[PDB]
Design a protein around this ligand. Sequence first.
Ligand code: NA
Ligand code: NA
Lengths: 860, 860
Amino acid sequence: FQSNASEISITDSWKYKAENDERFSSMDWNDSDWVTVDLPHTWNAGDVIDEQRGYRRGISWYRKKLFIPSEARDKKITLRFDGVASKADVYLNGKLLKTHLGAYTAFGVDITDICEVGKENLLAVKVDNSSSLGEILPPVSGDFSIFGGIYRRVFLQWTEKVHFVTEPYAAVPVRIQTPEVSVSEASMQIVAFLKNDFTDTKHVHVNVFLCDEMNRIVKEKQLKLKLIPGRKYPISTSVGRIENPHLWSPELPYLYTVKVQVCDAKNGEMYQEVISPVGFRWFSVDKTGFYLNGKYLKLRGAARHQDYAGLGTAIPVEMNRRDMRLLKEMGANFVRISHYPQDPEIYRACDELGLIVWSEICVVNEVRKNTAFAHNCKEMLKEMILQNYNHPSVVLWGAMNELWDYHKQAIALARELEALKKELDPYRLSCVAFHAFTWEKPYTQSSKEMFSISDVNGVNVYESWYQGDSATIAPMFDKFCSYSTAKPRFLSEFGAGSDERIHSYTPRTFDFTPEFQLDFNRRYINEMEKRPDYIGYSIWNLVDFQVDGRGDSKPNLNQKGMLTEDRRKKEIYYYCQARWSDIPMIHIAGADWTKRVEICDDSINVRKISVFSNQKTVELIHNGKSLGVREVVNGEAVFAVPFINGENLLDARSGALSDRLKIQMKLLSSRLTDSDVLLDGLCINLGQEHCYFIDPQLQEIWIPDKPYTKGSWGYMDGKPFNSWPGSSHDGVRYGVGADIKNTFLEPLFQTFLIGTTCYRLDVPDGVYEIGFYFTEPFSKDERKNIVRTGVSAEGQRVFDVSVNGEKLIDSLNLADSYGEQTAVVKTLVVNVRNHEGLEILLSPQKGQGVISGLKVKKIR
Amino acid sequence: FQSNASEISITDSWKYKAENDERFSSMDWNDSDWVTVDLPHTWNAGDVIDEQRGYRRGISWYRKKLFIPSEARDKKITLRFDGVASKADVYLNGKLLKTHLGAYTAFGVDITDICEVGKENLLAVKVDNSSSLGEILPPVSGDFSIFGGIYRRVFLQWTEKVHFVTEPYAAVPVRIQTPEVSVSEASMQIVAFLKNDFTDTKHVHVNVFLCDEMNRIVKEKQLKLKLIPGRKYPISTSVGRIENPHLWSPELPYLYTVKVQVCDAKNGEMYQEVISPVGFRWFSVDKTGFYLNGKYLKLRGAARHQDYAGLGTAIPVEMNRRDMRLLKEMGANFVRISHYPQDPEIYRACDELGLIVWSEICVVNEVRKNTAFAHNCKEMLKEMILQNYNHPSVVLWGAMNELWDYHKQAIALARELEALKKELDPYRLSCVAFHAFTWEKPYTQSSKEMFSISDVNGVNVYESWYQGDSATIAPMFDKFCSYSTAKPRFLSEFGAGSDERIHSYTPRTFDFTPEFQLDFNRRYINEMEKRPDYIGYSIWNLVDFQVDGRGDSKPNLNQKGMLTEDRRKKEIYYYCQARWSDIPMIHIAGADWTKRVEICDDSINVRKISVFSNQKTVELIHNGKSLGVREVVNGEAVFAVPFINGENLLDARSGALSDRLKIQMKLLSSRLTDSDVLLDGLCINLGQEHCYFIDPQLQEIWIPDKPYTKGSWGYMDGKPFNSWPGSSHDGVRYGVGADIKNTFLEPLFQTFLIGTTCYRLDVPDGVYEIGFYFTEPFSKDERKNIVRTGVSAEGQRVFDVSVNGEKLIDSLNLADSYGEQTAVVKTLVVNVRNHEGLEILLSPQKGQGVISGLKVKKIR
Ligand code: NA
Ligand code: NA
C-alpha cells in the first residue's frame, strides 16, 4: 500500500469548564464532573442571543485524554488547530508547549519528544476571550461578537523526519506563484523548506510533477541536494515550460495539480508528497474597471459571516461550502471574507466553484498606539497570507476596515501592512475599507494621505439606512472619489436590515420590511452598474448573523442578510439572482407574505406585485385571467393585481419557465357589522400605521392602526410614536429599537401610541376578551429626555385603564412594577349591551399613556 | 353605560421556585431572588425533550402580588383557574383556601371574604406533579407526560352578590338541555340555582330569552321568586314549542343564544345576565351507523393533544382554535378530545366551525383498587360534564382508554361512570376505547360485561405497525365485533409514525417514511368506508406530540400526526383532504422530498409518484410533456415519472385546479470518477438499504447502502442490522430505536452494519477526508443477548479501524470510552496513491464491530 495516512481528527469527547485555575493543566487533576463537549465548541453560542445584555468575556479550559496511534511512532508528531477564539495555551502532559494569539488563523504545535506514542496523554488548552486582550490584539471593537471557544476543528498530524518547514506560521508546505501567465504559455516558481530531523544525513530527490485536471502529466522537474541534520535548507526553484494553458476564471474554474515528491536517492523511500490545487490567471486594476485574463469584469457579490443559527461559530465544517454555493447560485462571482480570515474550506470552495475572493484581517474600527498591538497585526497578516496562498480564487489582501482616526501609528501601520503583502505575495492585489461617514476622520483630518496606500479602496455606504435618504446616495458615491482619487474604488458594504414578518405596501426607512430592503438594493445596484470605475461591489450581508447587544426587529441579530440565520433564502436573494445569474430564472416576490388581512370595502384590493426575472418579458396570470405581458426592466416587472377575498393564484410565466404563488387574502370591512373576524380575534398593531406584522406561531396577522371613524375602530387622540430628533429618522422610524423582554413579537411591542387617551371600536353586543399589550419602551436614561418620552419631571408614567366607565387597572406604572422594556399583557372580559360597543380610556396620572397593541375576541 | 366587566387576567409576572417550604405561603416572605414567569407556564418544557431520561415530577411554588380593582369593592370575588397540572393548594394572604386534585379541569376559589380591595394581597399556589399522586388520581400511566405548572390561564372575576351557584364543580352558571328536537319543533329546559349573599331579602325577576344568530328574540319568559339570604334556591323552567328550529350540524353549525337575566323586581337593578350559546340537534347509534338530525352521518376525524413544540403544554390559548381550524380544513367532522378534557376554547371553536366532539377524562391503562381513586374519577367526570354542558358539539362522554385488567373494581367503575354520565346529562351518548391486543386482558377474561356498558365501543388498532402486516388488518376489525356484540363500534385510534427526513420508494413497517404512513392509512380508510357498523373512525393523532421516553427517528416525540409539532402539514394531511374534504383540490405527493440523489447510470430514472385529489381525473405534465389523464381511484392517481438529471417540473391539473412541484434530482454513476460528489462528500447511510435521509441542516443526502461491486463502493462483509426476535418486525425493521445522545441525526446512527470487516471504495487518486459515524447501538440489558448483539460473552465490543494497511483507531470500546448509544465521529485524512482506492478494515478484538455512517470527501 503506497498510500499513507497523514492526520486523525481529535474533536471528540473533551472536558470543559468555565473557570480559570492554573491547576487544570495537570495530568493528575480530577475533571470527572466537567461537562463533555464535542468540537467545535464555543461558550457563547447562547450567551449572545439571550435576553440578558452583554456576554461573558473570560477564560475556560479544555482537557482531552489524547491517544497517539502506533503508526506515528518514530515520526514527527504535530497538532494542528484551525481556529481558537483569541488567546490559546496548549499544555501537554503538564508542560506548556505553545501560546497563540489571534482568533481567526490556524496554528501548529510540535509534541514529538513530549508525548508518549502508544500510551495516552493529557491535552489541556486554556482558551481566553477577555475584553482586556484588545490593548494588544485585534479586533479592538466592532459589529460582531467573539464567541470564545475552540470553534474550528483540531487534528493530530504526523510526517516523516525529513519534512517541510511550516512554522512558526502554519504556512502551506510549499508556496507556488505564477509570475508571468497569459493566453500563450505559463510560468510557475515554487518555494519551500526541507529539514532533516533525523540523526544521520540524507540525500534527496525532490520531484515536481504538474498534472492535468484529468491528471495527465504536463511537466516534470527533478532536483537533488544534501540535507545535513538540523539544517533548515531553502529551496527556490522555477519552471516556465507550460504550453497553451487552461486558465482559471469565476466562470470556467480550471485548477491544476502540482505534486511534489521528496524521495531518498540511494533508497527509493518517499519522505513527503505535497499536492496542492493551483490556478492560472492574471488581473489588474484602475479607474477603467477590473480586468481578469484580458477581458472586462465587474466584481459582483457579498460578505459572509462564519456563524449559523444558535450555534455560535462552532459550525459544522460542511457549512462553509454550503454558504459559498448559495452565493455562487445567487449569481455572484465574488465573496468578501470579512472581517477576518475563515476556514480552509471557504477558500477550497471558491476556486472549485469559481469565486474571486477578497480576504481581510480584523484591524477594525481603530488602532492602539501601542508597541505590542502593531506587532500582532503583522504576525496575523503573515499568517493569513502564507496559510492561504496557492489559492487562485484569492485576489485582494485586506487588513483595515472602517477606522475612525487615521492617526500617526495608524498611517505607519497602514504602510507596513502593504509592504509585507507584496513582499510575501507579489502577484496579488491589496485593499482597504473606509467607512462613509464623511463628517468624521479620516475625512475631517489634516490630510488625505491614507487614501493613497492600498491598490483598491473600499467604502461602507449606508445612506437611506442609518442616515441620509433616497437622494443622498449617488452624492455619497461621488464625494468618496473626491478622496480615493488616485486608485479605483469598491463598494465594501451595503445593505438594509429586514424581517420576514413585517410587510408594507409603502416601505420606508427602518421599518425592516423585505419591501424596503428590495428598493434599497435596487437603488444601489443601479448606481453601481453604471459606474465602471468602482470595479466591484459587495452586499452586506450574505447572511443574518448574531451580535449581542444589537436591537431592532430581531434583537441580538444583524438583519441585512440575504439569508436567514438558518440559510433560508429571503426574497432579496431572488432579486439579486435576477440581476446577476446567467442561469434563467423567474420569481414572484411575496413568497414570505402568503397570508394577508387588510381593510377594504370594495370587492377588489388592488396592490402592486413584482416579478423578478432574467428573461426579456414576463406574463403574470391572476386567478386564470392573464394580466398581460410586460418587459423585465432592472430584473423587475411590476403588475397591478386585483386581489379578492379568499385564495388568489398568481402564476408567473416567461418562456420555458414558471413560478407559482398562492396568496390567501381576507378583505375586512371597516364596519364591524360585516365580519366573522371578531370570533377569531381582531389583532391591532397600535402605533404602526403602514406595516402588517404576522406572528408565524399563531399565523395571527396584526393589522395596522387607523384613526377612529364612525361605525369603525381607531384611536381618538394621540399619535403613533416616531420622534428621533436630530436624525434622518425623525418622523420616519415608527417605534423604538429596544429589545423587549418576555416576547418574541418585537415589531408589535416596539410600536406604540403615545398620548392616546381614548380608543373606540363599535362592536355588537356580546362577551369580549379584550387583551392589552403594554411596555414601557424607554430606558431610564432616555427618559431623562422628558418631552420625547412624555414622562413626568422625575421620569414616571402612571396611568389608568377604564373600559365602558369602569376603572379596571387602577394605577399602571410599567417601569417600576414590571421593568422597563419588558412585555406586559392584560386581558379583560367585558359584556357589551345597548349598542355601546367598547370605549377604552387611558387616564394619565403621571406622564402620558402608552399602548402597543389590542386584541378583540368575541367569545359568546 | 349598561356594560360591565366580569373578569381580569392575573397571568402576568409571577414568582417561581422549585423548592417546597411551607413558609412559602407567608405574605412577608422574601421572594426577591425568585425568577419571574408569565402564565401559561409549565416547568417541563425542557425536561421532556432533553437527553436525560425522564422529567422532573415534584412540587414548585408560585407567588403573585394580587391587586384588586375598586370597581369590585364589596362584590363577590372569585379566582378562576382554567388548568393547573395535578395538585394545587391555593393560599391568599397566608390562609389556605382551596386544594384541588386533577390536572385537566378548571376549579374556582372564593376570596370575597379574605381578600382586600385596594391593598396588595399575596396569592400563593403550591403546584404538584409527583407520580406519588397517581395512586389516588388518574392518569396512572399512559403514553404522555404530565407537564407540571400553571399551564392554562387564570382569572380574577367578580359578580354581584345575587349570583348563580357555580361551586363545587365550577359548572356553567345555567345548564341547558333539549329533551325533544325535530325538524318542526324543539323543547328546551334550563337548570340553575340562585343564591343571595346580601344582608337583605331580595325579590328578583328571571328573564329567559332565546335569540337566533341575528339576536332576534325568538322566545321569552319571566319568573318571579324571592330569595332570603344564604339559601340555595333551585330553578328549572321549560320553554314551549320553538317551531322550525335551525338545526346544528358540522355542515351548518347554526348557534342560538340563551340570554338569562336576574333583575330586582322592586327597583329594576340587574344582578346577572348570563349569555349561553346552544344548538338544536338530535342523534342516535346502532350497528347501521351514526344518525344526526335524521340523516346517516359517517363520523371522520382525529384526536388532538395539548402541547406545542418547545412550549410543553403551556400553549397560548389561541393555538386551541388554530388546531381545530386546521382539522376542519382537512375534511373532518369529528374530533377526539383525549386523553383528557381540554381548554374551554377547544369547545367554543368546535361548535362554531362544525366538529362533533368525543370528550374523555383520563382513566388510562388501569383502574386502582382504592376507595379514593374511584371517588376522584367520579368528581372529574362531574367537573368535565358540568363545565362543558352546553356545547352543541359534544355528543360522546368518555372515561376509560385501553385498560389492561378489567378486574372486579374496574367493572364496578365502568358501571358507576356510565350510571353517572346518564344521571348528570341523559341526552348525550357514552363511549369507551379498548386496545386491540387480543392476547391480553380484557380479551382473555372469562366475562364480557366490559363490552356492554357505554353506548359505543372504540378500539385502537395498530396492526401493520406495532405487530402484524397487510394480511391482519381486516381480520382484526372483525374480531372486535366478536366482542362488541351489543353496542356498536368505533375506530378511536389508528396511526403510523413518519419522519419528514426519511423517504423510501419501497416502504416497509417502522421505517418511519411518510410513504408507509401513506399506505397504512389508505388500507385503513378503505376498510372503514365499507364497514357501516363502525359508525365513525378517528386518526391518531392530529399532531406530533411531545412525550418523554419514546424514541425512534425523532426522539421524545410521538410521530403519528397529520401535522408536525409546530402545525406544519405533512404529505398525509393532504391524503385525508382527498378522501374527506368536500372542497375540490389537487396535490402532488412529495413536497417534503424535493432534493433527491440516486445511483443511476442511464440518463432517465423512472419512479412512481402519487397525486391526491377529490376529482374524477388528474392529468400530470412532467417537464412540459403530458404523461396522460389517469382516473382517480380512492384519492390518488400514480404515474411513472421519467426523472432526468437536474430540475424536473410536475404540473398536475383537474379542470380548474392545479398543483405544481419542482424536484431537483442528482443522478449518480456507480463509477466514482464519473462525477463530483467526492468534492462535497459522498454521505453513505451504512445499514440502510432502502431509505434516503436528508440532513436538513446541511441539505446533505445520506444515500442507502449496496454491497460492493467493482469500480464503485459498498460493504464486503457482514449485514445491516434488522434482528427483532419474536416480533413482526424481524428482518423488516433496520436499526435500533434508542435515543442516540450527541446528535440529531438519529436516522443515520440507529441504522448500522454489523460484523462487517472490509469495505471498498474505488475512488480516483487524491487526498481524502473520511468521517466515521459510530455508536454502541444496544444497552447493557440489550447486550446480555450475545447473539443478537454480536458482543463478547462478558458483554463487550472492541475493534480497530484500519485503512490502506495503516491502523488509526487503535482499539475502540464504544459503550465504555464514550457511553452506550452516544454519537462518535472520527475523521481521517488519508492519501490515496497509485490506484489503490480505499480499503477500510474493521478488525475485532472482542465481539463484532458496528458502524453507522461514512462520509468520503476529496479535499485535494
Ligand atoms: Na403595536
Ligand atoms: Na447507518
